[PDB]
Amino acid sequence: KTVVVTTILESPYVMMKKNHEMLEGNERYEGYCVDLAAEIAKHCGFKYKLTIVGDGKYGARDADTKIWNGMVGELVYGKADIAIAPLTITLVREEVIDFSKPFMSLGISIMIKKGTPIESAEDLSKQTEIAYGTLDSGSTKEFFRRSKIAVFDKMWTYMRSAEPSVFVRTTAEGVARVRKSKGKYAYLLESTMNEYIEQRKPCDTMKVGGNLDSKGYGIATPKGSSLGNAVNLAVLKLNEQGLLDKLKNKWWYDKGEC
Amino acid sequence: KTVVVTTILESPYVMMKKNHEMLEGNERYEGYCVDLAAEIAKHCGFKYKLTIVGDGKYGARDADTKIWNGMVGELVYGKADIAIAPLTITLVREEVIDFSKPFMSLGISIMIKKGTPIESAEDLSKQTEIAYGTLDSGSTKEFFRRSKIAVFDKMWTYMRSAEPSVFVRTTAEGVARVRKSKGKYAYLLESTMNEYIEQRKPCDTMKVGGNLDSKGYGIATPKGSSLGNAVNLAVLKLNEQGLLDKLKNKWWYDKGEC
Numbered sequence A, B: 001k002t003v004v005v006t007t008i009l010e011s012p013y014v015m016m017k018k019n020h021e022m023l024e025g026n027e028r029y030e031g032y033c034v035d036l037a038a039e040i041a042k043h044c045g046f047k048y049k050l051t052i053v054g055d056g057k058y059g060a061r062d063a064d065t066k067i068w069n070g071m072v073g074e075l076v077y078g079k080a081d082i083a084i085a086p087l088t089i090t091l092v093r094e095e096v097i098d099f100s101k102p103f104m105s106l107g108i109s110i111m112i113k114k115g116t117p118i119e120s121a122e123d124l125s126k127q128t129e130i131a132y133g134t135l136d137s138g139s140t141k142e143f144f145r146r147s148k149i150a151v152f153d154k155m156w157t158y159m160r161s162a163e164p165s166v167f168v169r170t171t172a173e174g175v176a177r178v179r180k181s182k183g184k185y186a187y188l189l190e191s192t193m194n195e196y197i198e199q200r201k202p203c204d205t206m207k208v209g210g211n212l213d214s215k216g217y218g219i220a221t222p223k224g225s226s227l228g229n230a231v232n233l234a235v236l237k238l239n240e241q242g243l244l245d246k247l248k249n250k251w252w253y254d255k256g257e258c
């Protein structure tokens, strides 16, 4: 049986090729995760179909209904067999789905438009002139929502009630906001994305300060999946063979335009 | 009943207290992993007994006898119920024992005596005046033995045949060799240990270049252990609350001597 892979359109992990209009199936996409899916399928020996998550979300649980959305939801409800994307390994997710050992290490970071008077989270939490937010339905928003350390707690208090909303639907929306805000908006996103955007035209943003935490991305499968074990060993094998490092350089800096 | 924890005497993870001679059981030790063992046990709800691995090794499988040594061996043969130490998650090890999601992210790095004309792995591979080696029976030596990228394979070809041996039995042994070699010996060890020693008197060593790879440490249990699930969730919980970051600052920098 062909394994249904759920993923998300997020550069440079998964993007439609320039000429996708004349291409079919998995051939329409390119990116780090597209190359990764290919390797994993090769080592685990299976056929697969790449599908883009319907609601375009990573995955969070509705507090009222307790229903999971995004890619996590597609796995939880049997709509997908595996998720290959920049999906963060977290406690709440690990309780409902399975994760392979990380294929990428990262942390939450701050994105600013070049020139804005911000050097750290501390600096953001001490002022109100510059607005800041995070992605919705993801691990980053949950990070601030559940943080007890002073600076991050203060930040959550501000963001949670901010008006207009400081939260965005997609990473692209958060980046666009930083770029057209004349420096009045700062975006909190994972270092991987931040570093990627920093090397792309118009080269007007930059990552400032160190990472707020240390975590990683993992390939997720539904609880009790027969693919879990093989995938996990496959990830380890690829990291050790150097493939993962190869892919990182291929999509991040060999393609950098700044 | 009581969970037998295997660990290794490696500063600042596990060290004998100055007055351990007048203390009993677990109270005889201190360090990052000792602090971590206390928390894991608290959250998982079990009593434990800390024990230092007999052969003082991390773990590798003997080529011919096929017998695992070190902490990995303790778990494989049933001598310990869990290992809490700076044990690297690798494919060959995950094939015989279980690992929790990582509690620390690190990579192989180079340690030199201050003033040594070495800035990277490429620099070491292109010269012969400065010798270099790694730890025995560990993931670092295996990394080089299995590497297929030019620079690293070149380094392995040299190391595996260098005389006298460039490999050491313990981290401390490698650090001493660097300090006593007047710049003629460089040591390859994980960035975590490198960063730690850099802050220890006489403050004569330094980490140079970027990391050669990206990986992490995980708490290990015998395959199929009933402790596996809870321990993994405990690590994720503790990382998200910031404990792991707190512990590294405590043992690495708050106690720095340089």
Ligand SMILES: Cc1onc(O)c1C[C@H](N)C(=O)O
Residues within 6 Å of the ligand: A010, A058, A059, A086, A087, A088, A089, A135, A137, A138, A139, A140, A141, A171, A188, A189, A190, A193
């Ligand atoms: C990618 C990405 O970049 N910043 C973010 O918050 C995310 C989403 C995050 N990796 C998640 O799994 O929710």
Ligand SMILES: Cc1onc(O)c1C[C@H](N)C(=O)O
Residues within 6 Å of the ligand: B010, B058, B059, B086, B087, B088, B135, B137, B138, B139, B140, B141, B171, B188, B189, B190, B193
């Ligand atoms: C700690 C440490 O530091 N450098 C090293 O090679 C090691 C050992 C390594 N973590 C292992 O598991 O073999």
Ligand SMILES: [Zn+2]
Residues within 6 Å of the ligand: A039, A042, A243
């Ligand atoms: Zn391959």
Ligand SMILES: [Zn+2]
Residues within 6 Å of the ligand: A062, A063, A064, A065
């Ligand atoms: Zn709702």
Ligand SMILES: [Zn+2]
Residues within 6 Å of the ligand: B039, B042, B043
């Ligand atoms: Zn606790």
